[PDB]
C-alpha cells in the first residue's frame with residue numbers, strides 16, 4: 234500500500250487537478266485517444282471525433298473528462314479503502330464497456346503525462362512516485378475484479 238506520507242502527496246497533487254477538473258479531464262482523454270486510437274472506438278459517442286481539433290472543441294468530451302476525474306478523485310480520497318467505490322467501476326468497465334486492463338494502464342500513463350504538461354517543474358519526483366503508486370493500486374484492484382469476472386477484452 235501507500236504510506237501516510239505518500240497519500241498526502243497524492244492528495245496534494247490532486248488539489249492541482251481539482252482547480253481545473255474539466256481541463257485536466259479533457260487533456261487526459263485526448264492524450265489517451267490520440268496516443269491509442271483503439272480506445273476511441275470504445276466510446277460510440279466519441280467515434281465521430283476524427284481530429285484532435287474536433288476533440289478539443291467537444292464539450293461532451295470535457296463533460297466525460299469531468300465524470301472520469303470526479304470518480305477517480307473520490308476513489309483516491311479513500312486512500313485505498315475504496316472497495317465500494319471501485320468494485321462497480323471495475324464491473325461496469327469490464328462487463329458493459331469492455332475495457333481491457335491495458336487501456337487502464339494507458340489512461341494512468343496519460344494522467345502522469347498531463348500532470349507534467351500542465352504543471353511543468355511543479356510535479357516533483359516524490360509526487361510522481363506517490364501518484365504512480367496510487368494509480369497502480371487503482372489499476373491493480375480493478376485487475377483483481379476483472380480476474381473474478383474472467384474478463385480480458
Ligand code: HEM
Nearest residue numbers: 272275276278300301304305322325326330332336337340
Ligand atoms: C481513471 C480511469 C477511469 C475512470 C475513473 C472512469 C470512470 C467512468 C465513469 C464514472 C463512467 C460513467 C459510469 C459508468 O459507466 O461506470 C464511465 C463510463 C465509460 N467509460 Fe470510463 N473510466 C475510466 C477509464 C476508462 C477507459 C480507459 C475507457 C476506454 C478506453 C473507458 C470507457 C468508458 C466508456 C465507453 C463509458 C461509457 C461512456 C458513455 O457512453 O457515456 N473508461 N467511466
Ligand SMILES: [O-]
Nearest residue numbers: 297298300301
Ligand atoms: O471513462
